[PDB]
Design a protein around this ligand. Sequence first.
Ligand SMILES: CC(=O)N[C@@H]1[C@@H](O)[C@H](O[C@@H]2O[C@H](CO)[C@H](O)[C@H](O[C@]3(C(=O)O)C[C@H](OC(C)=O)[C@@H](NC(C)=O)[C@H]([C@H](O)[C@H](O)CO)O3)[C@H]2O)[C@@H](CO)O[C@H]1O
Ligand SMILES: CC(=O)N[C@@H]1[C@@H](O)[C@H](O[C@@H]2O[C@H](CO)[C@H](O)[C@H](O[C@]3(C(=O)O)C[C@H](OC(C)=O)[C@@H](NC(C)=O)[C@H]([C@H](O)[C@H](O)CO)O3)[C@H]2O)[C@@H](CO)O[C@H]1O
Ligand SMILES: CC(=O)N[C@@H]1[C@@H](O)[C@H](O[C@@H]2O[C@H](CO)[C@H](O)[C@H](O[C@]3(C(=O)O)C[C@H](OC(C)=O)[C@@H](NC(C)=O)[C@H]([C@H](O)[C@H](O)CO)O3)[C@H]2O)[C@@H](CO)O[C@H]1O
Ligand SMILES: CC(=O)N[C@@H]1[C@@H](O)[C@H](O[C@@H]2O[C@H](CO)[C@H](O)[C@H](O[C@]3(C(=O)O)C[C@H](OC(C)=O)[C@@H](NC(C)=O)[C@H]([C@H](O)[C@H](O)CO)O3)[C@H]2O)[C@@H](CO)O[C@H]1O
Ligand SMILES: CC(=O)N[C@@H]1[C@@H](O)[C@H](O[C@@H]2O[C@H](CO)[C@H](O)[C@H](O[C@]3(C(=O)O)C[C@H](OC(C)=O)[C@@H](NC(C)=O)[C@H]([C@H](O)[C@H](O)CO)O3)[C@H]2O)[C@@H](CO)O[C@H]1O
Lengths: 114, 114, 114, 114, 114
Amino acid sequence: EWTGDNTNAYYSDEVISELHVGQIDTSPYFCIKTVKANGSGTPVVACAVSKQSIWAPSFKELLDQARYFYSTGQSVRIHVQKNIWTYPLFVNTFSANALVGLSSCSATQCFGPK
Amino acid sequence: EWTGDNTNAYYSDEVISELHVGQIDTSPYFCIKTVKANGSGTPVVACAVSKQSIWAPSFKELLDQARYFYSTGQSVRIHVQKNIWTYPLFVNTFSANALVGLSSCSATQCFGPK
Amino acid sequence: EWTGDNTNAYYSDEVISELHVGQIDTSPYFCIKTVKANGSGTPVVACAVSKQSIWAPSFKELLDQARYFYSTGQSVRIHVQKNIWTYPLFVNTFSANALVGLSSCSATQCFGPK
Amino acid sequence: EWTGDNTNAYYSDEVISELHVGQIDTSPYFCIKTVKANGSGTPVVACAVSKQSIWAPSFKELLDQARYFYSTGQSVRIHVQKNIWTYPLFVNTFSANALVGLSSCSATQCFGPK
Amino acid sequence: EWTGDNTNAYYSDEVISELHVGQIDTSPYFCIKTVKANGSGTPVVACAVSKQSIWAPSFKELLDQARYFYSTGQSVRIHVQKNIWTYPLFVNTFSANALVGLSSCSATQCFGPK
Ligand SMILES: CC(=O)N[C@@H]1[C@@H](O)[C@H](O[C@@H]2O[C@H](CO)[C@H](O)[C@H](O[C@]3(C(=O)O)C[C@H](OC(C)=O)[C@@H](NC(C)=O)[C@H]([C@H](O)[C@H](O)CO)O3)[C@H]2O)[C@@H](CO)O[C@H]1O
Ligand SMILES: CC(=O)N[C@@H]1[C@@H](O)[C@H](O[C@@H]2O[C@H](CO)[C@H](O)[C@H](O[C@]3(C(=O)O)C[C@H](OC(C)=O)[C@@H](NC(C)=O)[C@H]([C@H](O)[C@H](O)CO)O3)[C@H]2O)[C@@H](CO)O[C@H]1O
Ligand SMILES: CC(=O)N[C@@H]1[C@@H](O)[C@H](O[C@@H]2O[C@H](CO)[C@H](O)[C@H](O[C@]3(C(=O)O)C[C@H](OC(C)=O)[C@@H](NC(C)=O)[C@H]([C@H](O)[C@H](O)CO)O3)[C@H]2O)[C@@H](CO)O[C@H]1O
Ligand SMILES: CC(=O)N[C@@H]1[C@@H](O)[C@H](O[C@@H]2O[C@H](CO)[C@H](O)[C@H](O[C@]3(C(=O)O)C[C@H](OC(C)=O)[C@@H](NC(C)=O)[C@H]([C@H](O)[C@H](O)CO)O3)[C@H]2O)[C@@H](CO)O[C@H]1O
Ligand SMILES: CC(=O)N[C@@H]1[C@@H](O)[C@H](O[C@@H]2O[C@H](CO)[C@H](O)[C@H](O[C@]3(C(=O)O)C[C@H](OC(C)=O)[C@@H](NC(C)=O)[C@H]([C@H](O)[C@H](O)CO)O3)[C@H]2O)[C@@H](CO)O[C@H]1O
C-alpha cells in the first residue's frame, strides 16, 4: 500500500479547520475537518484510528502533522482512503474516510502524489 | 466504548483554564479545568490517569491535545465520563470525571459528537 | 503514593526561573529553580531523575510540563518530596527535593492538591 | 556509514519549502523539498522512510528537525544519499534521494560535513 | 558519573548558534555549536551519539533541551566531556567533545554544577 495509490482520493488547496481527539474500541483516534482555502466547496472529514486499518502504523506521524498544519492554517492536500471506518455512529459524526497523507501546497503545486 | 457514547457527558464552548500534572499509584496523570468561553456557569474538572480506567489507551494523545488547546486558549468541547475516579482525596481535590475527548469549536459548531 | 499526599511539600505562586538538564549514575535528570512571583521568600529547587525514586514514571511528563511553564513564566504551584536525592555533591549543587507535581495558579487558587 | 561519508551529496544554503507525510509498505515516511535561499538553481527533494534503508534509525530525529527548519525558514544544508528509493511511482513523485542529515548554516558556512 | 564531575569541562554565558542532526554507525546523533553571548572567545562544539559513550542514556533529553535553548537564544552553560569521539573524519568536522549537560544562565550565575 502507499498514500499515493490511485485507489486513494485527495483534495488540494484545503485548510484544516477543526481537530478532534478521542477514543473508540480501545484505540485513541483523531479526526480533522478541512475546507477549501478560498471558501468554496464542501468540507472534507477524515480520521485516523490507532492500531486500526492498514494505515495504523502512521497514526502518530499523521496526528503530529495534522496538528502542525492545523496550527499554521496553511493550504494543504488531504489524502484519504474512502469507506474504511464502519462504526455507524462514528461515521455519522465524522466520516468513513481514513486519513492516509498530508502534503503542503505552498504557492506552487501540492507536494504529494497527484 | 466511544468518546461519543451518550452515557458520557460533554460541555461545549469551553476554554481550558488550568492544567496540573502529577503521579498516583505509579501512574503519571494530568487534570484540566475548563470554563465557558463567556465565563458563565460552573467549571468542569476532568483527569486522565495513564494506567487506569478504560480510557488509559488515550492518555498521551489527550495530554498532548489538552496541552495544545491550553496553549491556544481556543474554544473546545470537553467530553468526560462521570463517576470514574475513586480515591477520595483525589476526587475531593479534582473530580471523579475521566477525560475522554476534546473537540475544537467554531462560533456555531463543535467538531465532535453531540 | 500521590503527588497530593500530605507528607509532600508544595509552594504556591512560584515562577520557574532556571532549568538544567544533565546525567547522573546512568540517569538523565533535570532540575528547576523557582522563585515567588511577588519577590518574597527563598528559591525552591527540585529535580526529577529518570528511573530513580518512586517518582520515576512521571519523569517525562514532568520534564515536558516544567519546560512549558518555564517558557511562559506563569505562576505555578510546585510539589516536592523532600530528602529523596542522596548524592551529596548533586544535593549541594541542587537539592534533595524530588519534583512530584506542577499546578497552574489563578489569582485566588492553584489547580492542585493542598 | 555516516551522514558525512564522501559518497553522500549535500546542498548548502537551502530553505525547506514543502513537507509531505504518508505511509508506504506499512512504514511512515516523509519527504521535503528545498530551494536555494537566493532562488537560483533547481529544487532538491529527499525522503526518509521509517522502516527502510540504512538511515531508518534516524527517521524520527530527521522528521523532527525537518519540521523545525521548515517552520523557521532558515537556510540549511541538506545531506542525502542518492539512488536509494526504488518504487517507480514513488521515485517519480518525489525522488530516490534518502535524507541523511540536516545542518544549520551560519552567515558564511554550514555546520556540518562537506 | 555525573554531568558535574571534576573531569568534565563547562563554558558559561554561551548561546547555541548552530545545530546538526545525522546518523553514524547506525546511531542517530546531533551536534551543537555555541558562542559567547558577548561575541568574545572561541566557539564550543559538542556532540551526542545515541548509542555511544557513557552519556548515551541522556541522548534524547539533551537533544530536546539543546533544541529548546537553540530556539530561545538564551544564554546557557554548556557542559562537555573532552576527548570522547574518536572517528577522525567526525572529530575533524565537529569535535571530540561529548555533550553532557545544559544549564540556564542569568546575568550573574548559571543554574548548574561549577
Ligand atoms: C486551476 C484553475 O485554473 N481553475 C480551478 C480548477 O482547477 C478547480 O478544479 C480543481 O483545481 C485543483 C487545483 O489544485 C485540483 O486540480 C482539483 O483536482 C482535485 C484535487 O486535487 O483537489 C483532484 C482530486 O482527484 C483525486 C484522484 O483524488 C479530486 N478528488 C476526488 C475524490 O475526486 C478533487 C476533488 O474533486 C476537489 O478537490 C473538490 O472536492 O479535485 C481540481 O478539481 C476548480 C475547483 O472549484 O476551481 C478553479 O478555480
Ligand atoms: C462500580 C462496579 O461496577 N464495581 C466496583 C468496583 O468499581 C470497585 O472499585 C474498584 O475495585 C478495584 C479492585 O478490583 C480497585 O480497588 C479500584 O481502586 C482503584 C484502583 O487501584 O484501580 C484505586 C485508585 O486509587 C489510587 C490511589 O490510585 C483509583 N484511581 C483514582 C485516580 O482515583 C482507581 C480508579 O478509580 C479506577 O481504576 C477507575 O477505573 O481505582 C476500585 O475503584 C471494587 C472494589 O472497591 O468493587 C466493585 O463492586
Ligand atoms: C535488487 C534485486 O535483488 N532484484 C531486482 C529487484 O530490484 C526488484 O525488487 C525490488 O528491488 C529490490 C529488491 O530488494 C528492492 O529491495 C525492492 O524492495 C523495497 C523494499 O521493500 O525494501 C521496495 C520498497 O517499495 C515500497 C512500496 O515500499 C522500496 N521503498 C521505496 C520508497 O521505494 C524499498 C527501498 O527502495 C529500499 O529498501 C532502499 O533500501 O525497497 C524490491 O521491490 C525485482 C522486481 O520486483 O526485480 C529484480 O531484478
Ligand atoms: C568583568 C569582570 O569583572 N570579570 C570577568 C570574569 O568573570 C571573567 O571570568 C570568566 O567569567 C565567566 C562568568 O560566567 C566564567 O566564570 C568563566 O569561567 C569559566 C566558565 O564558566 O565559562 C569556567 C570554566 O572552568 C571549567 C573547570 O570548566 C572554563 N572552562 C575550561 C575548560 O577551563 C571556562 C572557559 O575558560 C571560558 O568560558 C572561556 O572559554 O570559563 C570565567 O573565566 C574574566 C575572564 O573571562 O574576565 C572578566 O571580564
Ligand atoms: C585498550 C585499547 O586498545 N583501546 C580502548 C578502547 O576500548 C577505546 O577505543 C574504542 O574501542 C572500540 C574499538 O573500536 C570501540 O569500537 C571504539 O570505536 C568506536 C565505537 O564503535 O564505539 C567507533 C565510533 O566511530 C563511528 C564511525 O561510529 C566512535 N564514534 C564517534 C562519533 O567517533 C566511537 C566513540 O568514539 C566511542 O564509542 C566513545 O566512547 O568509538 C573505540 O574508540 C579507547 C577509547 O577510544 O580506550 C581504550 O582503552
